[PDB]
RNA sequence: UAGUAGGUUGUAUAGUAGUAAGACCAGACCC
RNA sequence: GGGUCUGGUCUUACUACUAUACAACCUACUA
């Protein structure tokens, strides 16, 4: 089997997600909210924040993937258009990561199997922990495959350490959250270039993942620059920021935002609440009264950021640098003075 | 069995009402409308005009009674509070005639059988064309029973000739629309009083049902009164109406409204769109510019109204007359100008 | 008292409009509809088609004017911005004719009396059948006054014969629907221009109001033109209409639309459902398959239209003619050639 | 172009449809209705009855095709999935006939030209009155082409006489509403089979289109059979209908419905308000009280129906007959008594 | 009395709850929100999260009980179906704890007094701090009574130490939040058996994996997410716990906050 | 007199439209 | 080659709307 609204609500009530049990419960759809009657009183089960109909969005939310899955930004950068026999929920915007589905909900389904002709001109995300998906990826024309282990006859590409698990990114210890990515286009397997992976942290629950990051949060700016020999790279304004004018200077790394937040609180108004490698924020410092309309914040490991920034050479005043991050090219606007660097920020 | 939204929509699509078949179709609930996907495009199936949730109202509408059923005004006057194992749809206001149901929809059910203790202090409408309902009526404490035939041990009460059938009232020829009404209160059968029944007609599809009505519509105002000897009974004002002042005079019978509508069109704004024995209208005559804020219109057979007015014994100046219409008392405001009648209109 | 939602609903239930009685009834506001509980079941009382909140629109609808009132187009053309101590309901779009009110609903009120300073730079519609309104009009700076009779010290202006009464326009017989209009601007009484008044009819309930209209509805096109000496005025196109090409021809008078509708049914899609002197329609003829995207239809008495079309010389290649209709200037495009008119249509 | 909501509303206000002019007007989107401010008061321009967003549906409605276009049922039967550079509005359900568009609205566009790779595995409706569309049809892989005239190198297929024009079907006189249909699948032109075309009439504005229909609407049931020699074809029940039992007998042609409506009014509740060759109705006769839950009504010319019924032979008790109507197969359930056909109704 | 929407909004504006004052203020009902006009600009007063109409829910919210009241789980376990002359607001789901009311709001009222025949086959929650309610409980057929003190002729049952007060549970010091529970069924007083009472704490404001104390200890150690897929109030809570450090998650986790059939909160819990 | 300015009108360079007609180009049908 | 019908463009005459520049009239605030 039954694929109906009341069976989905029964599964949500008894297990929190659509498992596949048999049963039905009373359901009331008023406004965009789905209520259920428990002990004679209506209890809210789901509030629709999406653009889909109420029952369609509820069914997709209940059938979401609860296993560790790749972050939505990785899938978007890899060009994934649809997911095979699963729903990947984008918790950043509280909506499904993909408009259509394959064999999940009859209202949004374009097919019941990923091997149909309609699914051929689409990059389909194939899981690896579900049996039989590797064969479907081999027979698919366009598809992206993730695997905990290794696949015979293919060259694995190491992905990010962290992965999304019910909306909270983590480096799994009990469960393996590091996958191997395979991309197949037009029936030909394509290798993927080596890329630096964003750590996807947050200001509140910020924890350094390296010794250099620990020194950045604790040691002074001059001491940290002197110890690691970061002179002549404009590290004062690129990371720490300039809270002295009406507009901020630099501050394009999430680690600098975390350091400033620990020093003085401020507001990060995200005017595009989605998940992406590069985030734009409406930052307003509450102490110095300095605000910036657009602030491109990219969360990178500090050691790899140093390696990236020191592998471009100081020879021209201005240059555009293309860096492969999350399997996509990132355009960095680089300004260089003579002897030192002026400014290096993402576009 | 399955009791779900998609099975109900499948039954509506394939048969127009909930029959009890097995199947499911895609359903989208957006706004108060229930859409279904037919040939890849959404088709509207039901628009909620009720005060209930969208899916609850849709399920009640699909499970409505399609057999000839008594008019909602008769049930309200008899004091019916709930219907046993059926839904009676009030097409006048496009909502169920009763707030709760017995064994129909889990969201509105108060019980699964009419014999439970919760249903005891309620007048339950028991059908007669469904097997086993007569026994339930006998065992019920408060209930109203309708029967095409006769029931042993009970005195039948003849009901109205017409009955509702999918929202259009008719005097059935192929199907019997005349029932026998039995009312049982506190376990004791009560014999219903002798009463007149409203014909429940409309101005557009108005057809006379007696010789007197045909003469009323065909003959002039003076000719009709002279032929039937209605002098000194205010038939000109009460029935025909007086469109000569800023406010109307009389016009409290639907037959007079039909005659005027055939003569000159006008607007009847019903500010309480429900079904009742006495209707109040905001009548505005479009020819003479005469309007009346409240106009109590009661549809009665002309012969019965003549009998009622001739039995009034007009001797006192003012008197309140109680007339049993549709198993309920109707308060008629009677004014008599000593010698003849002054005005006789319902309150 | 009391000015509350439940008292308003009680008045609607017991009398159909807000009279001023004391009482309350259960009320449920869900969606844009206002329901009431009668005999244990919810009954719909009002569905909000306006741009106002549900209870605000319900209160304005209940307090609407039920007496014969001037049509909304006349008020808009006269420049009326607000109504004094009343609500004028625009039944064409099922919303109040004016955004704000004076002493009606606390949510929309800008004042409690029309004599306040905020109401001074506004043209206020003052009634005449309500006692004391004439004095307010005299003391007002900008205002429009209607009166069944005559007012001392002022020159009356005769208005249209018909007036709106609960959404249906009529030439009242029992009740006088013809008023005298007075307009006062900046404390100085202004006389209103002499004008022709639109009859405001409809295709379904269309009834001729003159001998010429009866002849038009009965006689053939050629016979009517011959009888009324309308030679060389494009009456075949301007009025009767030309359903011969892909686009329509002329057909800019409602009487011609009524004649065609009686001949062959068609659809008039009104893409701006409001009330105005000149109406634009998306007419699609169902017989010949001829449709026109924009069709300016103005309802005028056929004698008045004949006089208007005979009052303009036709030697110029083209000209824009301004005609005072419903106290406003209507622009007519006079595309003519060699004396005989080619077309004559308003704009909207 | 400018493609914005206010430009679309300006075009609607000044011309009734999106022509392509430059300008803007105030717009208010509250509920599903789009209002505009004219002379200081909001005027409703469009009420959304679709499943699309308010502004998307408004833009599609304004950019609809106002020229004579084929009826939506013909396009659905031909398998049209999308329309090239135009929007075909389905006035029966007040929604666009196709979910996606090509180069019309950026919210629903899948491409800007019909020659892109994404549009290749889709049957695209190509007009013929727009210059350059014939070349696109020739270069297209899957597409349907209509032409007023003839196309060199292709065999024309004569379509229906009538065509939709702003929601009202008509046999155009001033404008040609008869097209020639060409279907191309997988780059190979397919000839369409000879077929019968539904006249697509309605009960209210019903006008006979042949001598036989006039005789049917005037002559008696027995006289009409005698004159046209229809004995042993169950013409009494198939077309006229039988209002004698609880359920109707036959009445599967719209001409019979029109005749009955002229005789006695009744209600046709369409529980699937869409456009299709075969329509199912919830017919309830208001005179005899006879109702039928499902009534398959197909509007065919009486001469064509006679030709169909006289070419099936009377040899088996039950048989399924496939008839090509509107370029699609119609399944007719045929029951034959030994000697004469018993019941012949569409499924 | 006056019982109208504008009087209720006036009471909310001037006192925060329906006290019973006389007055009216402009009110706008758009969407499910009730706005009021203060200084010429609309100010939101109430957003409807319930299944009731906007004005009905607003009137019930304004007429809610602000005194210390028993927790909703205790009332549900005791079988309370309706409250006499008061509204008990369930702050966990932001909706009234009972579908119908007695003499509060005309849209939801089934009666004006708890002594009517319609209220007889219902367990009615009778207060004890309101004068005259004890007599109504004595005359009632089915009802539950709470009392700060003692009632003559009845055996008191000691209830939980904590009680709800404007949505925050507390062990009252200035005000007594410990009541004595009396249950009367079919006109016969039934004694309440001994039972253990849930402390009803929370992880954030916790002051001394199926016990809430273990959840609090883990939260102090490592943060995690508790997705409550049934946001209501009950003795036993099911959570969708996902540990953010070890990546360990459990779909259903029955968490009961305590200091085989077990008598907890006047009901039976099966382990 | 030296400056900063809101409404009305005119001139100049421009860009769209207008429910009539004529002309040019292109396509279809017929002779 | 001619006639009719459609898609695009120009002209006929008068007006409406948007953009910029300058001037005049009624006049507003300072030295």
From Swiss-Prot, chains A, B, D:
Where does it live in the cell? Answer: Host cytoplasm, Host perinuclear region
Q: What catalytic activity is recorded?
A: uridylyl-uridylyl-ribonucleotide-RNA = a 3'-end uridylyl-2',3'-cyclophospho-uridine-RNA + a 5'-end dephospho-ribonucleoside-RNA
Residues that coordinate or bind uracil = 292-296, 343-347
Report the active site residues: 237, 252, 292
Q: Which cofactors are reported in the record for this sequence?
A: Mn(2+)
Boundaries of every AV-Nsp11N/CoV-Nsp15M domain copy: 65-190
Question: Site feature Transition state stabilizer: at which residues?
Answer: 292
Role of this protein: Plays a role in viral transcription/replication and prevents the simultaneous activation of host cell dsRNA sensors, such as MDA5/IFIH1, OAS, and PKR. Acts by degrading the 5'-polyuridines generated during replication of the poly(A) region of viral genomic and subgenomic RNAs. Catalyzes a two-step reaction in which a 2'3'-cyclic phosphate (2'3'-cP) is first generated by 2'-O transesterification, which is then hydrolyzed to a 3'-phosphate (3'-P). If not degraded, poly(U) RNA would hybridize with poly(A) RNA tails and activate host dsRNA sensors.
Subunit (UniProt): Homohexamer.
Listed name of the protein? Uridylate-specific endoribonuclease nsp15
Question: Its encoding gene is what?
Answer: rep
């Amino acid at each position: 089997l039954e694929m109906s609204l009341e069976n989905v609500a029964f599964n949500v009530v008894n297990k929190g997600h659509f498992d596949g049990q048999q049963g039905e419960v009373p359901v009331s759809i008023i406004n965009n909210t789905v209520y259920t009657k428990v002990d004679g009183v209506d209890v809210e089960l789901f509030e629709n924040k999406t653009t889909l109909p109420v029952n369609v969005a509820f069914e997709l939310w209940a059938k979401r993937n609860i296993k560790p899955v790749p972050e939505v930004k990785i899938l978007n950068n890899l060009g994934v258009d649809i997911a095979a026999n699963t729903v990947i929920w984008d918790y950043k915007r509280d909506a499904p990561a993909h408009i259509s589905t394959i064999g999940v909900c009859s209202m949004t389904d374009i097919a019941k199997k990923p091997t149909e002709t309609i699914c051929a001109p689409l990059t389909v995300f194939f899981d690896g922990r579900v049996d039989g998906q590797v064969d479907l990826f081999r027979n698919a024309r366009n598809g992206v495959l993730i695997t905990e282990g290794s696949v015979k006859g293919l060259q694995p590409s190491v992905g990010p350490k962290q992965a999304s698990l019910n909306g909270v990114t983590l480096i799994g210890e009990a469960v393996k959250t590091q996958f191997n990515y395979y991309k197949k286009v037009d029936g030909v397997v394509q290798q993927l270039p080596e890329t630096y992976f964003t750590q996807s942290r947050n200001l509140q629950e910020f924890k350094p993942r390296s010794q250099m990051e620990i020194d950045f949060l604790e040691l002074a700016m001059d001491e940290f620059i002197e110890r690691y020999k970061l002179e002549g790279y404009a590290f004062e304004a690129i990371v720490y920021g300039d809270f002295s004018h009406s507009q901020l200077g630099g501050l394009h790394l999430l680690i600098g935002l975390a350091k400033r937040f620990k020093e003085s609180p401020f507001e990060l108004e995200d005017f595009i609440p989605m998940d992406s490698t590069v985030k734009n924020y409406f930052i307003t410092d509450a102490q110095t009264g300095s605000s910036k309309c657009v602030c491109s914040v990219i969360d990178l490991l500090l050691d790899d950021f140093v390696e990236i920034i020191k592998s471009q050479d100081l020879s021209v005043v201005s240059k555009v640098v293309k860096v492969t991050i999350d399997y996509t090219e990132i355009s960095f606007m680089l300004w260089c003075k003579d002897g030192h660097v002026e400014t290096f920020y993402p576009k």
